[PDB]
Amino acid sequence: LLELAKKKLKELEEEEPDPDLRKKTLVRNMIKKLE
Amino acid sequence: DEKVFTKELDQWIEQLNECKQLSESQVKSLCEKAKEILTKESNVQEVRCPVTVCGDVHGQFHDLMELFRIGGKSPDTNYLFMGDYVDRGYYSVETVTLLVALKVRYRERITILRGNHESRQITQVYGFYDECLRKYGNANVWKYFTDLFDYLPLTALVDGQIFCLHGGLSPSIDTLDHIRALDRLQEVPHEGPMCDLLWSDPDDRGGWGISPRGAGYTFGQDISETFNHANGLTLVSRAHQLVMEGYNWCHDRNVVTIFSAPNYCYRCGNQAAIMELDDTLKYSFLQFDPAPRRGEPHVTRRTPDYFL
Amino acid sequence: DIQWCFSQVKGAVDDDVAEADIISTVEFNHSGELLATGDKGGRVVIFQQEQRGEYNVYSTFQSHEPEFDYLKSLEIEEKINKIRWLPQKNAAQFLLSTNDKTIKLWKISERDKRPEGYNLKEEDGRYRDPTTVTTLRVPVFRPMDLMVEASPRRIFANAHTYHINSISINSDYETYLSADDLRINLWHLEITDRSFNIVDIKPANMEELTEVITAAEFHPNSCNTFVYSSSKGTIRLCDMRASALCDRHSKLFEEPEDPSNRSFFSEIISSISDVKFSHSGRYMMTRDYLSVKIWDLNMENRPVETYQVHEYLRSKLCSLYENDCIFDKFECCWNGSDSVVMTGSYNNFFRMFDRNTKRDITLEASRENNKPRTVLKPRKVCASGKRKKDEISVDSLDFNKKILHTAWHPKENIIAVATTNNLYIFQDKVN
Amino acid sequence: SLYPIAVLIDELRNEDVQLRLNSIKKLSTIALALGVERTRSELLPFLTDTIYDEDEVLLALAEQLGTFTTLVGGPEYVHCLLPPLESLATVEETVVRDKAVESLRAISHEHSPSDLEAHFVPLVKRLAGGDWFTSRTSACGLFSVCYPRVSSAVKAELRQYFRNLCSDDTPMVRRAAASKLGEFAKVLELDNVKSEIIPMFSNLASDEQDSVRLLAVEACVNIAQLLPQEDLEALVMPTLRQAAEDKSWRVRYMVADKFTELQKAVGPEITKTDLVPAFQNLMKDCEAEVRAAASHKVKEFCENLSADCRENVIMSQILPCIKELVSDANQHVKSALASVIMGLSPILGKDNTIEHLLPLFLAQLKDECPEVRLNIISNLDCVNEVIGIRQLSQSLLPAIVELAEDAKWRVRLAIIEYMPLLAGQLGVEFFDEKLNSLCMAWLVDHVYAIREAATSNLKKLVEKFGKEWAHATIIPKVLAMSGDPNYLHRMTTLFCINVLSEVCGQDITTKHMLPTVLRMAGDPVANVRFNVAKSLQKIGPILDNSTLQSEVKPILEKLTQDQDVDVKYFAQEALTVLSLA
């Protein structure tokens, strides 16, 4: 919930070699909306 | 007599003007002549000024023909290259075939060097093997061109004042007797002075550094000017690194990076400069945007014929 | 309610299926007979309806092959993302199909004729003397046994920098589209070198990325209307008449966001996954992660119906973030007469609602409890801790058996439900 | 003696695509060798239904079957080529179907009326009443070949079949019908045309698709060219008016692209009365392709208007639209308008030209977008022959001088290509007193292609100015150009000498230019030695022994001793070029 700062670990320790940008754009626009 | 051979080669040149596919015997004989010419040459090919210098091409045929138009038609104007005739390209085969043909026809009025991407593993993995499989269906052409690559001189000493090489410098290199001491009939190694020589890049970062490519090193400016003072050099031309501006001045103007392949990988849309060795050794650049591709691009905002 | 009755099942029985056995699309064809199931690896497997009959295998053909990129040198893959059929031009049937980069146009045709007659060779091919021939003979034709055989005819390739996630034949037998993550090209079914980029929402620089394109359709009657969806919740309704470049919308269907149920994930459980027009050309159902929601083509600012699929998950939504089970592309299909709608769900259940009586069901596609011609009784999941012998506590649903892909026979009442490694074909009881 | 034919007859049964293709192409020899009472019964039944799916095999087979009118047995048995062609007329491909239909039409002329009505009309009816939507698409193009020679009942039946086709379901069939509407109507009775084709044309021009409504325009053009002019206001004109205000920009673009022909068909009175408002609306359209297409025909349209009020209408109705279009935002529109704005000058008398056409001209020249200046310059001949460019040269000069120098050499190459026409149309003293400065810079330009173009333009000028002007102008400058450090600039003087010797004359070349060339022969760069050898080889054909053996021969002999290989080779080449064997 509010503790998503730790769950941010997903997009933190990822090394996407250009997969689809929907999953990246979601977790990338998810944190910036609050942090 | 040589006359009949020359007329046949000129007819084949006109045929290439027609963009015609070739047979095997022609390429085998051309490779045999090239190897016969090249076995007598050492690692340091002696190119006499004046000459037109060009860097990476990476098998883009259209950029090469545009270069030909800008710089004039051979042999009216001399030419030279600095490796990277394969990898990240679509038309490597035509590039190398035309290069070898013009070299054989004009042995002494054109020079071609070797590059870091002229390595068996690298060439096999980066398009060239697939390209040969598509155009001939067999690996004999791959073996022939690798044999030719083996003999290619590594570096070029222009008139004894300017030194030009594809990859970069190495810590263990202080004088050219090191390069002339190498046995150019070997596969490109992963370690050793020759690898760093062919796999290094300049480092604006102070001091030495670890090459991110995982093979080679990052020579600093100190070794560069020490080499220059020891051997009385002024500039050290180089290529193999992409620059959005076509050419850049770094390391207190000691290094000029030449790129002759606009839109390297067809994504960056860069400029391409050719640093011509004037008769008096000055440097002149004739920058050219990506060559207008014939009947391209396929994807356009403009309405095509079927839709209109 | 049409009581559904098990009819068939495909695939194996052992639950250790390799990666190249996960069914990745299911698509009937315009008249109803055939049924393609393009699992991973590319191995399209076409089922024909036995001249109701059951479905027996018709052909099989590796469509795509594991490729390799040159410049970006990527592991360009071989999954089958979509399988669209074409109408019937002659005794052969065509079908596009796409991995993340290419679009092929296969062609399936029967053949029952073989040349019979030789001139310089014997019946085995053993050649005779060259000059002893005296009277030429021309090969004759004589029957053999049906040998169905597929073969690619065109290959539309190398136009999409990003991955492909849609195609749709245009309603005039000529063209179609293919929408990658950021652009939409309008190909032509007979010109395999040029395209026509018809939409582009890529920004100037990449780092300011907001939304992408997660679906695209056409109109079943109009020739100039696609409906490309959007990864924020909006749905443009483009129009290829008013201007050659259709970048500007002609409508914009967007729910006037409800501030009541606003939560932490209020943007990741509201990203459309598949938009599907409505067999007549009026409604345009779309399925986000938690509710199918039937828009209307004449009333932009609100939908006219909203069906909650698995409402019992809005609590576990937190726990659904650490196992990547919240990014799942569910898919919804219409009835043949625009009165019933179906969508997949978790733990092998597949909800199918009902538009005109507002009822709803929840069946279960599974093996160890069903035999042919029996009936599937509605499974009813319970959210609370009060569980009595006919409900499943939400602490027991297996979040690894997702019924993503589904189809529905155009006219008749047969459906095909594709779980991870099977293809149950539940029909209803013909009485 | 029949071994090769025995090989060829079995070679169309292998698996190599090339082998089968070659056998199909050579089928003529097999047919000739088999005979005539055996071909029909053995070879045709084998080609009836083939399993070859390659576009390059079926295409060749259809094209070959289209030329079997004689081997089959003569014009009496030509109905034996139908079974094997009807099977290609209904294949999934498109070019194959087109070729099969063309061959069917070509062989239709060999039938006889009774044979036609007995064996060919059944083929058409069948294909046009078939089941797949390819039999009908291919049948929709065999009416214009079998209508004229059939009886009345067959004619009525064919008309009914076509009318049924025009109301088909699959848009493909309706597209084919719309495409062949005009070709069919061109052979119908005039009263039958009026009473039967017009309803079809209306029903196809008010379609629900647009790939049909766009072809309805060409159908309208043909129909209008067919009917007399006393009914165009009640039969055809309403449909054209509706199409000129259509909703899908493709239909409006098609109407714009077919406007000169539409005017020529409808006639001058209807043109002047009704089309002009439609043309204005097309120019002021919200799209871009429509505006470009409508602008492309600005000249062809205004040139065909009625002579009674051509100048009035042009200045009262069309001029403001062009004035607005000149400052348009799109690029294609501006380029297209510029390329043809020059046709309006000779329509006024040069008075209205100077009064209002001049500004637009300056705006176009001053445009900062490329290819607009190129198009405006390339067609200057009009005002030159109307206003006397000498008057406007004061304005031309700044534009030409600013366009001569740019960044990319592409514009520099297109304008250097256009240079000779303007040079010829301008004058002698004016050119020499002004653009002479430009000429010099052109030769020392950087990009080599521009050097080629400058040398070629010099050649063209000196071929238009002959000897005296060149001798009094370039001779000293080009001669002195031989001191530049860059060897490219000296070679440029070499090519200039080569190109200008044949126009300046040996009496002056050998007397002044040649000694310099002989001096250049000893350049410290091999690139020049062999160039001076090639130049000698090029001027030899106009050089005699008196000076040849005196100066040239020692030079070639010395060159043949050079270290470089190419210098020796080219000196030897010259030595032989002296017609010495």
Author numbering:
A (entry chain D): 1 to 35
B (entry chain C): 2 to 309
C (entry chain B): 9 to 59, 68 to 447
D (entry chain A): 9 to 589
From the paper:
Instead, PP2A depends on its B subunit to recognize and bind to specific sequence motifs that are often distal from the phosphosite but help to position the phosphosite in the active site of the catalytic C subunit of the PP2A heterotrimer. We have previously shown that Eya3 recruits PP2A–B55α to dephosphorylate pT58 on Myc, increasing Myc stability and enhancing primary tumor growth of triple-negative breast cancer (TNBC).
Kruse et al. have used protein engineering to design peptides that bind the proposed substrate binding surface of B55 and identified one of the peptides, B55i, as a strong binder of PP2A–B55α that inhibits its interaction with substrates. We next incubated the PP2A–B55 complex purified from HEK293 FreeStyle cells with the B55i peptide and determined its cryo-EM structure to an overall resolution of 3.5 Å. The C-terminal tail of the C subunit is clearly visible, and its conformation and interactions are similar to that in the PP2A–B55 + Eya3 complex. Density for the C-terminal helix of B55i (residues 21–32) is well defined, but the density for the N-terminal helix is much weaker. Although the main chain of the N-terminal helix can be modeled, the side-chain conformations are less defined (other than K10), and the density for the connecting loop between the N- and C-terminal helices is even weaker. B55i binds to a similar surface as the Eya3 peptide, mostly contacting blades 3 and 4 of the β-propeller and the α1 and α2 helices positioned above blade 5 on the B55 surface. In particular, K10B55i forms a salt bridge with D340B55 and a hydrogen bond with the carbonyl oxygen of Y337B55. Residue K23B55i forms a hydrogen bond with D340B55, and its aliphatic chain forms hydrophobic interactions with F343B55. Residue R28B55i forms a hydrogen bond with E223B55.
